[PDB]
């Protein structure tokens, strides 16, 4: 309570550059694509914003019966990577990507 | 987000009149209709609808029909609480009938 | 410490915050507001104020001459005007990208351009402009006119030329001239440039300024006029088989009453619009001429008004005192003034549609719905300020004790039930349109279109049979081809009129059905429901039971605390805020009306709106969500196209829009604290604490956050539903 | 033959509708067998729709151009043409039952009145009361009619009202 | 039990109780006599 | 893999029987999206008698619970220290609430 | 009685420091001092946020607002029923004291009190803004 208004004013400034660094993109690519520019859009093939920590997360635990879980058979999840499971011809699991799409909407 | 998520998923609720899905039709109206309801709650203060109140009392006053308990509005902080209700049901109900009728139909 | 900006109130001025720049910038035109304000110059700053207005709108329309000269294609579309899009203006924006210098690449134009939805090219081209030189010399007229009118209204704020505060006190004479001359002389000039230039540019001929005292008007030159023969300037009118713009079937009557379009444009008849003018023209110079002035006839105003007292009292002192109610408040005029305005603009637009009065209008189908939304938008905000201004009269301006007993009085006399009523109006309604539609809804939803609630309009349909739509077969008075109406009409405008009519191509008086009864009656739930909240803050204005001495706290004020319940929103202002959602949710529903009723005509599928208007998914399904498709895909993954700038401003609108909603629910004491932890951040903060704000950062006071939301919506509201209506309309015409 | 509105007896459209609105109640019922559940109530949906059908065609109902069922709301047009029974005597079948539930209601309200506390007699009901008056607001209109001409419907000058009246 | 029936007389149960009856008689009303669009019998 | 799970169906009254869609199984109701039939079949349950006889267990409990509610409000409520007791009722709640459940469902 | 002169070597209350304090307010404007003697050294809130512990004998605190004074002023006559009174200093050293203007508490009367902004008519006896039109600055009928 002593010291809240540090707390309020960084958590304000951190909400504000989110914000920003956040929605100004879609609306930076919006305004691009519109404009006919889509070779300066914060997009998977222009200006790529990978989620490479996430990425590697990713990597880590697909990989992860290999070495850091060898009693483990397969990893928790297929969404790390590796095959699809498909039941009924429908998929049940299957890897997900994570793109510039995704690094923006994470944040 | 707007054209390839809500436009072009939304085909299956709204084109659901006579299915079985219909109800999900029906329910992403109404949702939208209390979700704009909400708003006469939120964008409005308890002032105006005093007066509006009083000046019914009148007419009910005049035919004798003037209830004992007698008639308010809702107060500020129940003005803010009806319109966050209907709010957030009308919004998560639009979002549940669009996700139903499309994952049914698709899926 | 004192600053210096709001000249007008040293109260603002002596404001350390922000709310001063702000409260500034919105108290400056309230004149009788500011800090030692005379009535006599609060009406002269009105004066030159009203100056200022005429010159920037004649500045405009010079722009718009000026642009469309320069960098429209206003030569070409005279040639295929079916054919050509009109240019507004060219596009230069660094910003756009190769593929888009080539999407607004339109219109035969040599770069990027705008499409003109204003509908000025068929103006222009009807009132008998054809080179582009015509509109530079006009743009230029219109330039050197507005030069004056600032020159006018500088100079009538120089001492001798300053008038007194009687003179704008002179009703009778400011009558007779505004409606002699100003109304009636000057459409006596139209009709005189109608019979000697716009007609004549139809018929093929030029006539301008270098030959117009040199071609005759008619071939029996004023001859007609002077003997009273006056049938003879309609003797030979256009015929059927006439083009415009050309002497082929040319015709040489100047004054007709054809009635009904001219067949190849589907507009007005020129010579019945300067008959018309004519018309009009003399009926306002005698009505101009009875009011007294210096001359010794004439009627007094006052004496009109204070001798129309009903007897048995039905009305009180009836208009006893009026006058000076009128005279001495400037927001009882300025209400009557915009109330009549709005209803004219909304004239305007109900026959503009259906009676189109330029040339190949009708078939520029962005032009219709762009003009019918714009006038009808402008009509609701205008209509909304009358009501608005109608309070700040009863609040700024009205002495109880000097209207004892008149109309106006007996008004807030019986105020309770004037709003029950209203109350009972706009709930049944509501109600019953509703239940209707949901009843509807749902049958469509369990597959049972044919337990629908589907009534038959048969009152307007009725009315539309009386002016001779012969589709229905109640056969009363110009469907009735034995009538009295319809037999001594055959002479006159009926046959044209008639063959209008029945052609169920245009927009004269439409087809109706259920849709159309439902539509309606939210038409007139929307305007019931308007009228309540804007009467009703008009009306408690100067007192309610929650707060009696509301008249001594003025029009706009925030609240009166949370005490007696709580007392937010209670000023009328909160009543106009509150009003104006409720007028853009009405004029949405008839433009939506309007535009999906037109869409379906257009493209040859009134079945579509007949059979889809009787629910609301059929609303949503197919005019909603059909007609967007085009516009959303503006610009895609897959490139762009010209609704790209109509997408983008849907989506511009839908963000101004939510962005008000902030500043409607969210309100203000959460903002305060913010500004308050960001203000120790800001004094805080190394290399920062030493640029320091001059004037305090305070959140946006209550009464500014309501106005600041409701302009960020009604400007989302307008940017989205244009955006819409624009790209559905060009792009598919 | 009213508003070129033609009966639904001879609108093709009309027929067109029923006879679609079965054939998609067959196309589910073909997935079934016999007598199964859901055959059961297919076959009881479709006699629904045929009697519906029937019952509206034969009650002498105006179809527009998409064969639907339009509703004649004016008075003189609905009694000459046969048609009362859509808007006309429903209205003042409605209008007695609103007039009944505004009368009892009414009356209650009156009634409590009286007593020391008359709020806690509208939060908690007196229902040997409310259904007295619910059984006698029968005759509303007539009692309604007799309080309108002896001056007792109404409350005279003794309503409250803003400082400018 | 005086004070339970002053209970069931509360403006809640009592709506609720009467909101019942309305509409199961609405219900049975248009089970029996389906599809009503217009008054003919 | 082709039966749409349903554990709802419409009384066929005001033409509301449309939404007793054909989810298959020769059955007609509301494809429901609870994820219970999944969640009995990974219980083990193959049968509608033991969902019933699991229904009545639970009206039973719920029986139990207004009993328990009723008994320790109204006939033997416990004081305050009892409450007060955070370390037994986390040792409760950890092992047998959460460690003697899951023992119990791992059985 | 008399106005008291603030004495400045007054003790203040323990407190190990907030964010919600003094800002340049004070250097430039104005700011504000409660002063009280406690009895015992007792905890209570400040309205900065924050607890501080008041000392036996004369306690001083500064403000930066006259409500954060009033608001402790209530708080310790509510709580602890002690007297305070509080002043506004100014960055040019000049204090002027504020809170008992009179001495005792305006809540009770001490007879020599003159009264101010006393309308001596009822509150629907105000005149029609039309009446005070013009007035110079824009004014309200109850002047
Ligand atoms: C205000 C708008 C409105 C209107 C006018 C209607 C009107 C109608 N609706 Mg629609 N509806 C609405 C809103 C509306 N609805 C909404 C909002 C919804 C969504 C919830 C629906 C959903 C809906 C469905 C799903 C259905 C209807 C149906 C109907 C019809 C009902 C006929 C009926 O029940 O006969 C009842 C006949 C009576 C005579 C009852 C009158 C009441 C009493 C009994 C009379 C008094 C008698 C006597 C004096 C009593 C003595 C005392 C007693 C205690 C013994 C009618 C055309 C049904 C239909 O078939 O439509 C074609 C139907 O299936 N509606
Ligand atoms: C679309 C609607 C909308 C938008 C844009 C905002 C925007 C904002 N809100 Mg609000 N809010 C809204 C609706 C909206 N709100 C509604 C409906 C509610 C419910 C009542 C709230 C309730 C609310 C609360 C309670 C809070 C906010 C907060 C915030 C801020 C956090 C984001 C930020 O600063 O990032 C940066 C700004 C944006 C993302 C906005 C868009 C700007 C883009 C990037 C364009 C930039 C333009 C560029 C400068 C060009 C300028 C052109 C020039 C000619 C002027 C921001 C000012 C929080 C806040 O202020 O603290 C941080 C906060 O506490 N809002
Ligand atoms: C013949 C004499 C005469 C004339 C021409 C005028 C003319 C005017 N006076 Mg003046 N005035 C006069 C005598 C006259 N007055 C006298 C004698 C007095 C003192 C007793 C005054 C005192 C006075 C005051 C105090 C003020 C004016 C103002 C005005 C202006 C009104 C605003 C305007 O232009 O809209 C004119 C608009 C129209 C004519 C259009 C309305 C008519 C139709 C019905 C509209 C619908 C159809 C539409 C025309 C079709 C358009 C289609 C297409 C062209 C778009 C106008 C220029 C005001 C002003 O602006 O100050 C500069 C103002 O404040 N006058
Ligand atoms: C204020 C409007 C106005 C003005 C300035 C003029 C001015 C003129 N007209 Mg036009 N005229 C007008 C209105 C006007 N007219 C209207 C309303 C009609 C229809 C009744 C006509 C019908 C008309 C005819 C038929 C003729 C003129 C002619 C003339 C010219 C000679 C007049 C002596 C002069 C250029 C005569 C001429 O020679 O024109 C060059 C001529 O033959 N005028
Ligand atoms: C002939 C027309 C007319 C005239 C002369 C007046 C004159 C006046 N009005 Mg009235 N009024 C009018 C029309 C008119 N109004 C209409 C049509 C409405 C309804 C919309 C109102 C509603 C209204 C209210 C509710 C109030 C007034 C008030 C006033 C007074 C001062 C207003 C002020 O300070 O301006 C300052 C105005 C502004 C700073 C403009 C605000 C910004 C607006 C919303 C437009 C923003 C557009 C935006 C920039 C677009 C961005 C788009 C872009 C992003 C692409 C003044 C006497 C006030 C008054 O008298 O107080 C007692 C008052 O409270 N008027
Ligand atoms: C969809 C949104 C919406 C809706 C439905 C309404 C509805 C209404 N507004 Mg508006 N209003 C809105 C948005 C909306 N408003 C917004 C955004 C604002 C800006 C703040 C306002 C500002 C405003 C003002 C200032 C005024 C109104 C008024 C009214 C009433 C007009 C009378 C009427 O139509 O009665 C018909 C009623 C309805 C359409 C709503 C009821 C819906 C059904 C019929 C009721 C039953 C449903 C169901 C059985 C309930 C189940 C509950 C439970 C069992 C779960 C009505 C309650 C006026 C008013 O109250 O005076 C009469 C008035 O003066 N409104
Ligand atoms: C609400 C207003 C209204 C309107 C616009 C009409 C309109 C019409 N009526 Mg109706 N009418 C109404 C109310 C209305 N009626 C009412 C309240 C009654 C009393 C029950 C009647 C009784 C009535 C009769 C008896 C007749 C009309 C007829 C007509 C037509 C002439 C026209 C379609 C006539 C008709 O059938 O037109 C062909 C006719 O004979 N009206
Ligand atoms: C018939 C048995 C019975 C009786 C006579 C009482 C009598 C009393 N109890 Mg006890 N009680 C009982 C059973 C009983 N209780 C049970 C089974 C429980 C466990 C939940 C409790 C728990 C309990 C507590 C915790 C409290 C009482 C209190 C009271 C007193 C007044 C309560 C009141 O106003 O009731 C009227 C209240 C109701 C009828 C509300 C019932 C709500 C139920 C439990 C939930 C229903 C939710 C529903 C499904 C939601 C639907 C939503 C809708 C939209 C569909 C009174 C001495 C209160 C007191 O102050 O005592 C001195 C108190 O604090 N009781
Ligand atoms: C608040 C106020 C105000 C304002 C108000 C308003 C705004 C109002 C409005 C109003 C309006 C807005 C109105 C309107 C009206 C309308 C009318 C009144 C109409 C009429 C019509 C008629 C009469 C018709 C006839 C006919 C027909 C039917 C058709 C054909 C032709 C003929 C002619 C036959 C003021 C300022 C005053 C002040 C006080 C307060
Ligand atoms: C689903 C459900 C249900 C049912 C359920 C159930 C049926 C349950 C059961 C449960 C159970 C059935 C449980 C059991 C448990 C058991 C346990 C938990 C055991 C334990 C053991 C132990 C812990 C051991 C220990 C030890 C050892 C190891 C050895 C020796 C020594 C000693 C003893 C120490 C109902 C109806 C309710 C309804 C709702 C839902
Ligand atoms: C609409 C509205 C109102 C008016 C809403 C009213 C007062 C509440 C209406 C609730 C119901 C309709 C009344 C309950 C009456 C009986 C309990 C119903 C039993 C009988 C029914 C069958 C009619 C406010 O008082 C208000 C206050 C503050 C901010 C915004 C608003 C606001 O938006």
Redesign the interface.
């Known amino acids: 309570?002593?010291?809240?208004?540090?707390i309020?004013?960084?958590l304000?400034?951190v909400c504000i550059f989110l914000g920003f660094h956040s929605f100004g993109l879609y609306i930076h690519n919006?305004?691009?694509?519109?404009?006919?520019?889509?070779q300066?859009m914060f997009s998977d093939t222009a200006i790529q914003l990978q989620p490479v920590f996430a990425q590697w997360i990713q990597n880590t635990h697909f990989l992860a019966p290999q070495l850091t879980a060898p009693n483990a058979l397969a990893a928790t999840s297929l969404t790390w990577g590796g095959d699809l499971v498909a039941?009924?011809?429908?998929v049940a699991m299957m890897p997900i990507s994570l793109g510039t799409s995704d690094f923006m909407v994470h944040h | 987000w707007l054209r390839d998520f809500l436009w072009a998923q939304s085909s299956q609720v709204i084109q659901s009149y006579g299915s079985a899905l219909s109800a999900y039709g029906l329910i992403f109206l109404g949702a939208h209709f209390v979700w704009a309801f909400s708003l006469m709650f939120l964008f409005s203060g308890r002032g105006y609808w005093q007066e509006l109140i009083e000046s019914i009392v009148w007419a009910h006053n005049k035919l004798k029909v003037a209830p004992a308990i007698q008639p308010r509005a809702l107060s500020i902080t129940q003005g803010r609480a009806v319109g966050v209700a209907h709010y957030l049901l009308g919004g998560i109900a639009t979002t549940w009938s669009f996700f139903l009728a499309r994952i049914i139909s698709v899926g | 410490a004192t600053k210096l900006f709001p000249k007008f109130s040293q109260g603002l001025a002596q404001d350390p915050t922000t709310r001063r720049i702000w409260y500034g910038l919105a108290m400056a035109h309230d004149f009788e507001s500011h800090d030692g304000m005379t009535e006599e110059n609060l009406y002269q700053k009105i004066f030159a104020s009203h100056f200022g207005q005429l010159s920037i709108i004649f500045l405009w329309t010079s722009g718009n001459l000026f642009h469309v000269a320069w960098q429209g294609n206003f030569e070409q579309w005279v040639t295929d005007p079916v054919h050509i899009r009109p240019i507004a203006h060219a596009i230069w924006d660094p910003h756009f990208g190769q593929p888009a210098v080539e999407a607004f690449t339109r219109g035969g134009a040599s770069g990027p351009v705008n499409i003109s939805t204003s509908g000025v090219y068929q103006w222009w081209y009807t009132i008998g402009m054809r080179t582009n030189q015509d509109l530079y010399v006009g743009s230029v007229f219109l330039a050197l006119v507005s030069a004056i009118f600032l020159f006018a209204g500088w100079l009538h704020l120089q001492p001798n030329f300053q008038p007194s505060l009687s003179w704008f006190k002179d009703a009778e004479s400011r009558l007779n001239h505004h409606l002699s001359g100003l109304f009636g002389v000057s459409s006596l000039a139209w009709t005189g440039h109608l019979v000697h230039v716009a007609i004549p540019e139809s018929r093929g001929q030029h006539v301008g300024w270098d030959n117009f005292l040199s071609v005759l008007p008619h071939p029996q030159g004023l001859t007609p006029f002077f003997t009273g023969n006056w049938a003879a300037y309609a003797q030979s009118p256009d015929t059927a088989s006439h083009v415009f713009g050309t002497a082929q079937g040319s015709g040489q009557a100047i004054l007709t009453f054809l009635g009904g379009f001219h067949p190849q444009t589907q507009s007005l008849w020129l010579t019945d619009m300067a008959h018309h003018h004519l018309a009009i023209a003399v009926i306002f110079i005698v009505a101009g001429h009875m009011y007294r002035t210096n001359f010794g006839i004439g009627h007094r105003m006052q004496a009109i008004l204070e001798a129309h007292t009903p007897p048995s009292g039905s009305l009180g002192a009836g208009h006893k005192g009026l006058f000076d109610t009128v005279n001495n408040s400037l927001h009882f005029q300025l209400g009557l003034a915009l109330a009549s305005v709005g209803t004219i603009t909304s004239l305007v637009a109900q026959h503009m549609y259906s009676l189109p009065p330029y040339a190949f209008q009708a078939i520029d189908f962005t032009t219709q719905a762009a003009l019918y939304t714009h006038h009808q938008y402008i009509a609701g905000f205008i209509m909304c300020g009358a009501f608005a201004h109608g309070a700040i009269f009863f609040i700024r301006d009205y002495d109880p004790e000097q209207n004892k007993g008149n109309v106006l009085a007996r008004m807030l006399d019986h105020k309770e039930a004037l709003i029950s009523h209203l109350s009972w109006v706009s709930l049944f309604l509501g109600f019953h349109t509703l239940g209707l539609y949901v009843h509807n809804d749902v049958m469509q939803a369990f597959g049972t279109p044919e337990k629908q609630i589907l009534i038959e309009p048969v009152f307007a349909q009725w009315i539309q049979a009386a002016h001779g739509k012969a589709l229905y077969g109640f056969d009363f008075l110009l469907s009735s081809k034995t009538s009295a109406a319809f037999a001594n009409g055959q002479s006159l405008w009926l046959p044209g009129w008639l063959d209008a009519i029945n052609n169920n191509q245009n927009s004269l008086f439409l087809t109706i059905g259920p849709g159309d009864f439902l539509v309606h009656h939210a038409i007139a739930l929307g305007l019931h429901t308007t009228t309540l909240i804007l009467v009703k803050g008009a009306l408690d204005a100067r007192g309610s039971k929650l707060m009696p001495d509301k008249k001594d706290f003025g029009y706009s004020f925030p609240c009166d605390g949370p005490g007696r319940g709580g007392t937010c929103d209670i000023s009328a202002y909160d009543a106009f805020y509150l009003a104006v959602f409720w007028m853009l949710n009405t004029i949405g529903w008839v433009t939506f009306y309007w535009h999906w009723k037109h869409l379906t005509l257009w493209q040859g599928n009134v079945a579509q709106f007949d059979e889809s208007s009787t629910y609301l998914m059929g609303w949503l399904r197919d005019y909603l969500w059909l007609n967007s498709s085009q516009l959303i895909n503006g610009y895609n993954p897959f490139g762009m196209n010209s609704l790209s700038v109509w997408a983008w401003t849907f989506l511009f609108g839908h963000l101004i829009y939510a962005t008000g909603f902030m500043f409607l629910i969210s309100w203000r004491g959460y903002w305060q604290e913010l500004i308050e932890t960001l203000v120790w951040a800001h004094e805080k903060t190394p290399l920062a604490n030493l640029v320091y704000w001059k004037d305090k950062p305070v959140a946006l006071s209550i009464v500014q956050a309501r106005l600041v939301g409701l302009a960020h919506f009604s400007v989302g509201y307008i940017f989205t539903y244009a955006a819409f209506l624009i790209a559905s309309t060009s792009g598919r015409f | 033959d009213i508003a070129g509105l033609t009966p639904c007896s001879e609108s093709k459209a009309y027929a067109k509708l029923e006879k679609k609105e079965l054939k998609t109640l067959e196309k589910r019922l073909k997935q079934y067998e016999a007598d199964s559940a859901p055959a059961v109530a297919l076959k009881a949906t479709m006699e629904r729709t045929k009697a519906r059908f029937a019952n509206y065609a034969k009650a002498g109902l105006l179809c527009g151009n998409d064969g639907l069922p339009h509703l004649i709301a004016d008075p003189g047009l609905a009694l000459k043409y046969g048609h009362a029974g859509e808007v006309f005597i429903p209205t003042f079948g409605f209008l007695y039952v609103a007039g009944y539930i505004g009368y009892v209601g009414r009356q209650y309200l009156i009634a409590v009145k009286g007593e020391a506390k008359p709020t806690d007699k509208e939060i908690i009901i007196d229902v040997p009361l409310a259904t007295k008056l619910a059984w006698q607001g029968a005759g509303w209109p007539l009692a309604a009619v007799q309080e309108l001409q002896r001056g007792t419907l109404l409350e005279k000058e003794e309503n409250i009202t803003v400082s400018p009246r | 039990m005086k004070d339970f029936t002053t209970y069931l007389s509360t403006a809640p149960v009592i709506a609720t109780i009467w909101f019942t009856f309305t509409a199961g008689l609405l219900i049975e009303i248009n089970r029996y006599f389906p599809d009503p669009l217009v008054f003919s019998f | 893999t082709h039966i749409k799970p349903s554990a709802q169906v419409v009384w066929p009254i005001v033409g509301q029987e449309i939404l007793n869609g054909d989810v298959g199984g020769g059955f007609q109701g509301i494809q429901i999206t609870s994820g219970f039939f999944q969640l009995w079949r990974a219980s083990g349950i193959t049968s509608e008698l033991q969902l019933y006889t699991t229904a009545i267990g639970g009206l039973v409990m719920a029986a139990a619970m207004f009993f328990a509610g009723w008994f320790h409000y109204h006939k033997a409520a416990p004081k305050l220290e009892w409450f007060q007791n955070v370390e037994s009722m986390l040792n409760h709640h950890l092992g047998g609430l959460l460690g003697l459940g899951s023992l119990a469902w791992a059985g | 009685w008399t106005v008291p002169t603030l004495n400045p070597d007054t003790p203040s209350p323990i407190f190990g420091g907030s964010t919600g304090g003094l800002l340049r307010k004070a250097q430039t404007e104005e700011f504000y001092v409660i002063t009280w003697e406690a009895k015992k050294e007792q905890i209570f809130e400040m309205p900065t946020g924050g607890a501080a512990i008041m000392r036996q004998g004369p306690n001083l605190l500064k403000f930066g607002k006259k409500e954060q004074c009033l608001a402790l002023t209530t708080q310790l006559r509510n709580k602890f029923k002690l007297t305070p009174c509080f002043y506004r200093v100014f960055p040019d050293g000049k204090v002027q004291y504020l809170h008992p203007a009179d001495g005792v508490y305006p809540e009770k009367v001490n007879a020599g009190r003159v009264g101010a902004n006393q309308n001596m008519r009822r509150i629907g006896q105000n005149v029609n803004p039309i009446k005070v039109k013009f007035s110079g600055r824009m004014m309200s009928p109850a002047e």
């Not at chain 1, 309570?1 to 540090?6: C, E, G, L, T």
């Open positions: 309570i002593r010291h809240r208004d540090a309020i004013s960084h304000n400034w919006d305004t691009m694509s519109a404009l006919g520019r889509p300066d039941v009924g011809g429908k």
